[PDB]
Design a protein around this motif. Structure first.
Motif, PDB file in Angstrom:
ATOM      1  N   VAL A 160      34.831  48.663  50.329  1.00 39.09           N
ATOM      2  CA  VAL A 160      33.805  48.601  49.058  1.00 39.09           C
ATOM      3  C   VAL A 160      32.493  49.542  49.226  1.00 39.09           C
ATOM      4  N   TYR A 169      32.003  42.902  42.865  1.00 37.95           N
ATOM      5  CA  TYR A 169      31.840  42.122  43.712  1.00 37.95           C
ATOM      6  C   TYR A 169      30.792  41.019  44.180  1.00 37.95           C
ATOM      7  N   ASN A 184      41.497  48.496  49.441  1.00 44.26           N
ATOM      8  CA  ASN A 184      40.417  47.040  49.303  1.00 44.26           C
ATOM      9  C   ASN A 184      40.396  46.643  50.158  1.00 44.26           C
ATOM     10  N   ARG A 213      33.755  48.922  41.582  1.00 41.98           N
ATOM     11  CA  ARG A 213      34.085  47.775  42.259  1.00 41.98           C
ATOM     12  C   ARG A 213      32.697  47.127  42.936  1.00 41.98           C
TER      13      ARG A 213
END
Ligand SMILES: [K+]
Ligand SMILES: [K+]
Ligand SMILES: [K+]
Ligand SMILES: [K+]
Lengths: 162, 160, 162, 160, 160, 162, 160, 162
Positions: free
Chosen positions: F37, F49, C156, F45
């Protein structure tokens, strides 16, 4: 024996490239001369060299230069002989300037251009040999042997190592 | 009058460029053949053409192609004759793809490369002539006449 | 087990790149052969290899070359199999010559081209796997696992270090 | 007759290029769908299309886009199917931006990239056909016929 | 009224570009000559022109050429006068070949290079004028007037 | 304090570049989050986001990627926030691929693109600061101080050394 | 209704591109001024414009130029406001010169750069709108409507 | 003695290139000043320097910059003096960005542009000398001597070494 190919280059620096042409002509037993001629610093030398090349018995000129590479083209402007050009790799533009300055000759004045760098120098010698082999059976046989050995030396599979 | 130069090109569309080589060889009275040979569409035709070129009496091959231009290089792979390559201008990349795919031959198999487009086609013919002139004095004289006229014909000043 | 993918390359030098394709096929348990075939130095070998590929049971050819990179295209000229091309990074032009020589095939004879260098080699193996997975459910499952692990391995946030 | 190839493109303007892929698939009688999907304007449409492609029975996706051309790469990110990418010629940079934004995929997510423009669109269809021919003998025969006719049709010499 | 600037160009076709230099020198009332000199087709003409330029009273040479553009560099090789180079737009590579073959002079023999095309031709004339203005107060005043009018003439807002 | 800028990047490798953006936001006292990312390896993801960025209180997204650099553009496709793109230098093509993949967005979905490499990362942070300074007088004053010091730190002449 | 965005461009010819930014700001009802400012021909005009922009109440500057495109960078040098740069397509190099001269700003003085040509002009306006929307809820709503309509309007399939 | 050439550059980093111009002017005994002037970080300094150059007795300005290289062009916008531009080699794009940002000036405001890097710096000094030599016979003689020695120092053939 009298030279039949002239290898000319703009600088000592260029010889790190052009020495590959010199070596290959020696391997194929083609008499040649190897000289420095700068289009920009010795322009009168260039004019004279190119003007007199044919009467001196030269058959092919191999010219190498980098950057704003004018030596091969200006040589061709002064001789009816075949002129082969080798772009020398340049620091910033990696020979793209050399390549375009040599290959993009306007119709009327040719330069047969080879690859950037050492490959090009080697291939200029080989192209010169191909030209001379048209009228020289001994050399034609040496060139055919060279090409056959090249082919035969390629293995069937790669080596795996660290 | 058997041909001593072979002009080959990848497609009919390439002839708009390669006709300039054909015209120049005719002007200098150099016996030649002008053919279509595609590296990608007629690879067996190419292999046979290149393999037999020397024994048929050809002395120089002029090969024109555009895009991923493989015809000159593959010709050189199969013959010991001098092979001259003409990059044909492509639609999108304006012959930069043609140029790099022809000139950047690795050491061992040469192609003498000329300029992109019609200039290169004309110069391939003239380079072929300069090669043949080494052995043919009548042709050497015509070539010197060609170059003398080219030089003399340049005007001294431009026109309005 | 009999090969279903052939990895071919122009030189030993090219194997530093193409070994990444070889490794990935091995990881996904795809039988393959890995060979040197030079378009320019072994053109008759290339013709034969490509002509006979389908009858030998090959399904996909991965071909890597640099410079005036003709190997993938000439392979495609001789086989109806899918041919995937990997541009090998070149010294002066950093694979731009390789890329354009491979990707700019005229309509009629395709080469599916991947990125310059090791990324391209890895992705040629993965694209070959995607093709084979259409008819091989075990392999399809291995490929889905590979992609899931890839996704799951992305953290992340980055690590801050000197 | 459910589709086995999906041709998708970023805009109506791209169809001037991608119609050549559509035409070739029809010529070879390969069931397909031809759609507009924009990575930048319809990103949810793209995600859903790519996510569901395999379960809908698609085997190959052909994706064409120009400029910052993200459609093929993002499709490949969401499907395990082979994704083939066609760079559409752009106004200013003539598809060089298209080409680099499609071909330079980092390792792990492939896109098989074809030439800039109409040649690439046709070749994407032919590459899709070559993939499908591995499992479909009737199609393999039609593909071999296509290639044989392409080879045989090349003239031996150019026309005036 | 003997010329103090020489505008030379490789061909008649280059005049479509170099006429803009000719026009600007006339506008500023700078005595000049406008000539064709080809590095490749008339190399002896070039050598003589460059060699004799200073003793004939020229102070600046403006040289335009396209493609493998050697005219400015070879001129600079034969004269100590300032040589200004104008890359002429070429058909395929749009003057990128012209630009690199002119600007990338190795240390020892300079060419002051201007933009590709008509902008560069105009700017070569203006740079020549700025050089001559160092010694010629009447010309310096005309040059300042030229620059003042250029600045003042720019509109504040665009038109529909 | 809650982040008002999000710095996102495709990989840990990209952080060698993007850390310069992170440092500059910290210097100007702008709260931010810094995340990995991947457009290609974590596409769901990315969607999440970008979709949720505005409701989470983010005002600007700085996105860095290399090669076929799709992260900034796909982020912009999913958010109405200003998205600033940093091209990461790539091995073969030295960020030319990164640059063109980011800057050449079609009309309708913008990405404000900065220079290749560390300069671009620093300038993305500064452009983000310029945006936030429109509504934040304390920050506007810090940014004016930053620019004044920058100007004042330029010497009048160079140092000559071996 | 005092302007909050300034669209500036180097010449009247640039307006063929920058009018697309002007049109988009009008569509979103963002008060703005549209002006010609040349970095090279009116450098004092530029310095004054950029220096006074913030105190006049501007929040974003959109600057378009072609060739050696210095206008955006020099604007950013004189203001702390966000400066967005639009590379105008140039005749010879198709905006590649424009692009590099705008985007490659060294660290310390940013320019947010958009695509070459009309796409970039439109996107500069939209990026300006996205910046203003951070503080203006009515505008944020119009911007979301704009994006929703753009997304919804993309057809599902191409037309013949 | 009062300077007649001003050498200006954007940064200390640029001096590794521009020092070659400084050295050559010193060799030819041309009085000059060598300064740092940043178009982007000291724009008011640039305006003042260029505006006042002619009244201060300068005859030629040599300006060097890299990247988005605006210093030479903005100098030319403010002075009627001849301005010569040296593109400094940049990290990612190897001075291609520098070159295009300097040479592609629109008609009306000229910058005489030299080669990327040290060659360009040396040649900017030499071009400046050529300009000054038009009105300075002593300098004209020094420049002719420089060029003659250059020509005479070129050997006829290269040295072969390992
Ligand atoms: K072996
Ligand atoms: K973790
Ligand atoms: K100091
Ligand atoms: K000696």
């Amino acid at each position: 024996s009298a030279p039949v190919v002239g290898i000319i280059m703009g600088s000592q620096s260029d010889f790190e490239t052009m020495r590959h042409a010199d070596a290959l002509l020696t391997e194929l037993e083609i008499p040649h001369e190897t000289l420095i001629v700068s289009a920009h610093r010795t322009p009168d030398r260039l004019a004279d060299y190119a003007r007199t090349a044919a009467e001196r018995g030269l058959n092919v000129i191999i010219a190498g230069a980098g950057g704003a590479a004018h030596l091969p083209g200006m040589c061709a402007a002064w001789t009816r002989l075949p002129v082969l050009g080798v772009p020398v790799e340049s620091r910033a533009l990696k020979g793209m300037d050399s390549l375009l300055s040599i290959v993009q000759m306007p119709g009327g004045v040719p330069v047969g251009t080879l690859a950037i760098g050492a490959s090009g120098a080697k291939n200029a010698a080989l192209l010169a040999a191909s030209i001379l082999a048209l009228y020289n059976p001994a050399l034609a046989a040496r060139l055919e042997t060279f090409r056959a050995l090249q082919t035969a030396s390629v293995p069937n599979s790669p080596i795996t190592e660290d």
